Scaffold this active site. Structure first.
Site, PDB file in Angstrom:
ATOM      1  N   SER A 216      55.074  81.568  65.859  1.00  0.00           N
ATOM      2  CA  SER A 216      54.012  81.710  66.515  1.00  0.00           C
ATOM      3  C   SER A 216      52.935  81.262  64.842  1.00  0.00           C
ATOM      4  O   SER A 216      51.716  80.493  65.302  1.00  0.00           O
ATOM      5  CB  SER A 216      53.571  82.494  67.192  1.00  0.00           C
ATOM      6  OG  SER A 216      54.313  82.756  67.979  1.00  0.00           O
TER       7      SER A 216
HETATM    8  C1  LIG Z   1      55.305  83.838  68.106  1.00  0.00           C
HETATM    9  O1  LIG Z   1      55.723  84.151  66.130  1.00  0.00           O
HETATM   10  C2  LIG Z   1      55.867  84.592  69.155  1.00  0.00           C
HETATM   11  N1  LIG Z   1      57.147  84.393  68.608  1.00  0.00           N
HETATM   12  C3  LIG Z   1      58.641  84.232  69.250  1.00  0.00           C
HETATM   13  O2  LIG Z   1      58.547  83.671  70.264  1.00  0.00           O
HETATM   14  C4  LIG Z   1      59.646  84.425  68.882  1.00  0.00           C
HETATM   15  N2  LIG Z   1      60.359  85.009  69.157  1.00  0.00           N
HETATM   16  O3  LIG Z   1      59.802  86.076  70.582  1.00  0.00           O
HETATM   17  C5  LIG Z   1      60.673  87.250  70.237  1.00  0.00           C
HETATM   18  C6  LIG Z   1      59.625  88.433  70.886  1.00  0.00           C
HETATM   19  C7  LIG Z   1      60.743  88.439  68.821  1.00  0.00           C
HETATM   20  C8  LIG Z   1      62.104  87.517  71.134  1.00  0.00           C
HETATM   21  O4  LIG Z   1      63.232  89.077  70.397  1.00  0.00           O
HETATM   22  O5  LIG Z   1      62.612  86.339  71.599  1.00  0.00           O
HETATM   23  C9  LIG Z   1      60.525  83.177  67.901  1.00  0.00           C
HETATM   24  C10 LIG Z   1      59.363  82.245  68.055  1.00  0.00           C
HETATM   25  S1  LIG Z   1      60.461  81.029  67.088  1.00  0.00           S
HETATM   26  C11 LIG Z   1      62.263  82.040  67.257  1.00  0.00           C
HETATM   27  N3  LIG Z   1      63.403  82.047  66.087  1.00  0.00           N
HETATM   28  N4  LIG Z   1      61.551  82.957  68.379  1.00  0.00           N
HETATM   29  C12 LIG Z   1      54.873  85.887  69.653  1.00  0.00           C
HETATM   30  N5  LIG Z   1      54.691  85.730  68.512  1.00  0.00           N
HETATM   31  C13 LIG Z   1      54.463  87.144  68.194  1.00  0.00           C
HETATM   32  C14 LIG Z   1      53.209  88.210  66.864  1.00  0.00           C
HETATM   33  O6  LIG Z   1      52.601  87.168  66.982  1.00  0.00           O
HETATM   34  O7  LIG Z   1      54.072  87.940  66.382  1.00  0.00           O
HETATM   35  C15 LIG Z   1      53.838  88.024  69.449  1.00  0.00           C
HETATM   36  C16 LIG Z   1      53.759  89.154  69.747  1.00  0.00           C
HETATM   37  C17 LIG Z   1      54.626  87.699  70.972  1.00  0.00           C
HETATM   38  S2  LIG Z   1      56.005  86.425  70.686  1.00  0.00           S
END
Ligand SMILES: *C(=O)[C@@H](NC(=O)/C(=N\OC(C)(C)C(=O)O)c1csc(N)n1)[C@@H]1N=C(C(=O)O)C(=C)CS1
Length: 473
Positions: A216
């Site tokens: 993100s």
């Molecule tokens: C951005 O970092 C978003 N992250 C993701 O969508 C990822 N995983 O989401 C979680 C919920 C952790 C999962 O288990 O799937 C992701 C992106 S790249 C990768 N390898 N995984 C959002 N970020 C946040 C944040 O602000 O930290 C959120 C609260 C909503 S998901």
């Protein structure tokens, strides 16, 4: 005749690596063989065993030169010399001493047995620092690191790692106006003055050699591409209901799924993957890739640290829909903490990227305008709302100042917790990235784990730099 290695200092002249005199003892065994009655006293003074030492000299009886021992203090060296053993001679060598020890170990690096750079700055500027054996001494080098900010960053990252029971972490602070790395710390760390033990994992400069998915934290670059397209404005709305989006066999999903219409700031606040993916389909992945490439994500930093990782920014001639979405939300990209900090510095510096430097910069090089000033200014405002608005990353707030940033949480279930940002929003001075690897307590989101470290470090760094507080009437 080894040459005196150049002093390494921080940006204000505080010593970080200092050449220390040591005594090396050599012998002409042909002369040592004439004084066997002296050998047991000599063995004891060298540390060595009586019979093993005696076996060694007898084995080299026909040689005119052998080394007895290297790198004794010039106290134990004088003690061997006071034995007056025929055939024993001394040579003055140098061993480094690192006054700040574990605090700046990864950035400063260290030397091998021959006083040559093995890691960090010691290795990267080995030619400058080494000089030439006889003998011409090496040259002094002032780093961009500010030891005061380094101590603060070291302490806070160590405290956060213990509070979260995490595996590892990195924190980088950059001066957005000059391209200088003001602090660079990682956990685990090591004491470079202790030449025993030496755990390879603890010696890794993770901020430069470990790649991770930024997730993100790349969404502000996707938004910069949206605003530069001519097709989007912050007040525009995207319908993200029902919090999932099917693209063939792939499903894009949001963590919070109780939204329908979100404005562009709301997409960043709620960190909606669905919302940023819908914007990406509209503008095309080519525009997003170009912004991320231009800010340096997955690109060579130009720092010249051997073993430094470039990572990867995926590219296509024809972008399929799933890859367009994943690029926009930072999945499947591989970057370093230094690259991410440098990208946030260009955004904070009204869209101008100033070359990265690990050395003190007196004459700033020209920057490259990578994002238009208007677009960078708009995105900065949105990131200030990410930190300040209702439902935002309140733990990244810096009391006294307007701060801006973006959280990230990457599923590697094991996680990486991220926060990247800058301050003060009225005239940004510092960009910072906090990466915590595998927090093991209830909270793992970037806004819970990494955002408070950003707040603590930013609060102290702005005050150490005498930046005037900008949350004024
Ligand atoms: C951005 O970092 C978003 N992250 C993701 O969508 C990822 N995983 O989401 C979680 C919920 C952790 C999962 O288990 O799937 C992701 C992106 S790249 C990768 N390898 N995984 C959002 N970020 C946040 C944040 O602000 O930290 C959120 C609260 C909503 S998901």
């Amino acid at each position: 005749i080894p040459a005196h290695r150049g002093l390494i200092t921080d940006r204000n002249g505080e010593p970080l690596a200092v050449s220390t005199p040591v005594t090396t003892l050599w012998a002409n065994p042909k002369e040592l063989m004439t004084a066997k009655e002296r050998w047991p006293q000599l063995a004891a003074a060298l540390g060595q065993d009586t019979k093993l030492f005696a076996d060694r000299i007898e084995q080299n009886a026909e040689r005119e030169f052998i080394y007895l021992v290297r790198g004794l203090t010039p106290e134990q060296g004088e003690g061997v010399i006071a034995l007056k053993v025929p055939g024993v001679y001394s040579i003055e060598e140098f061993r480094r001493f690192y006054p700040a020890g574990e605090v700046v170990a990864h950035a400063v690096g260290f030397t091998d047995v021959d006083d040559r750079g093995r890691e960090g700055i010691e290795l990267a500027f080995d030619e400058w620092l080494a000089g030439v054996p006889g003998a011409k001494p090496g040259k002094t080098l002032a780093l961009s690191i500010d030891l005061r900010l380094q101590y603060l960053a070291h302490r806070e990252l160590r405290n956060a790692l213990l509070e979260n029971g995490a595996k590892a972490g990195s924190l980088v602070i950059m001066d957005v106006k000059t391209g200088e790395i003001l602090a660079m710390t990682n956990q685990p760390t090591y004491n470079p003055n202790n030449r025993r033990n030496l755990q390879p994992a603890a010696m890794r400069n993770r901020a430069m050699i470990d790649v991770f998915e930024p997730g993100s934290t790349v969404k502000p670059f996707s938004m910069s591409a949206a605003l530069a397209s001519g097709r989007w404005k912050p007040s525009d709305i995207v319908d993200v209901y029902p919090g999932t989006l099917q693209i063939g066999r792939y499903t894009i999903r949001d963590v919070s799924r109780n939204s329908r219409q979100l404005d562009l700031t709301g997409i960043l606040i709620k960190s909606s993957n669905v919302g940023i993916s819908k914007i990406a389909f509209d503008i095309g992945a080519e525009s997003i890739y170009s912004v991320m490439q231009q800010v340096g994500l997955g690109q060579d930093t130009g720092l010249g640290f051997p073993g430094e990782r470039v990572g990867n920014l995926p590219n296509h001639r024809k972008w399929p829909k799933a890859e367009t979405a994943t690029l926009a939300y930072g999945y499947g990209l591989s970057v370093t903490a230094i690259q991410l900090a440098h990208a946030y510095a260009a955004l904070a510096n009204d869209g101008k990227s100033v070359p990265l430097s690990m050395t003190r910069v007196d004459r700033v090089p020209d920057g490259v305008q990578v994002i238009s000033p208007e677009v960078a200014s708009t995105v900065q405002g949105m990131l200030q709302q990410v930190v300040e608005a209702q439902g935002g990353v309140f733990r990244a707030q810096v009391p006294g100042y307007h701060a801006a940033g973006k959280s990230g949480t990457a599923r590697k279930n094991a996680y990486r917790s991220l926060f990247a940002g800058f301050a003060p929003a009225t005239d940004p001075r510092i960009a910072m990235v906090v990466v915590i690897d595998e927090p093991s307590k209830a909270g793992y989101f970037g806004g819970l784990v990494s955002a408070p470290v950003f707040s603590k470090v930013m609060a102290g760094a702005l005050r150490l730099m005498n930046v005037p507080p900008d949350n004024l009437p």
